[PDB]
Amino acid sequence: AFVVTDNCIKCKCTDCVEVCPVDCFYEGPNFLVIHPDECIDCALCEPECPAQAIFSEDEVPEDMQEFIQLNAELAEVWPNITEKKDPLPDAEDWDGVKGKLQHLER
Ligand code: SF4
Ligand code: F3S
Numbered sequence: 001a002f003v004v005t006d007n008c009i010k011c012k013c014t015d016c017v018e019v020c021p022v023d024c025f026y027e028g029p030n031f032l033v034i035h036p037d038e039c040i041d042c043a044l045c046e047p048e049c050p051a052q053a054i055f056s057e058d059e060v061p062e063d064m065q066e067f068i069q070l071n072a073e074l075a076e077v078w079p080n081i082t083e084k085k086d087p088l089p090d091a092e093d094w095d096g097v098k099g100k101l102q103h104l105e106r
Helices: 015-019 066-077
Strands: 002-004 025-027 032-034 054-056
Touching: 002 032, 002 066, 032 066
Parallel strands: none
Antiparallel strands: 002 054, 025 032
16 A cells, blocks of 8 residues: 655655545545555655655655554545545645654544
């Protein structure tokens, strides 16, 4: 499965949803997650993230391993998103900044 990690938080560009064939992205107030049992590992979303927050599960950075289980869990409670929308208002302010996990809204 692929994994949305820290830099999506407070950016939420949603460009990634355009290319998923199986529609497995689920939407939070200020983050997206990939449903691990639905992702077919086509790797198509990851060139599309402007914030470069998507990784193959096995390539998720050591310091961002928490995101793997987070994606699994929130994928059960969040709504499915299928169309691209506007990025969060302050997206480019928050892009490239580290430790945005602290601001995750559920
Ligand atoms: S690897 Fe493919 S199936 Fe998975 S979330 Fe990405 S675009 Fe979708
Ligand atoms: S910022 Fe997030 S909404 Fe997608 S386009 Fe990137 S994983």
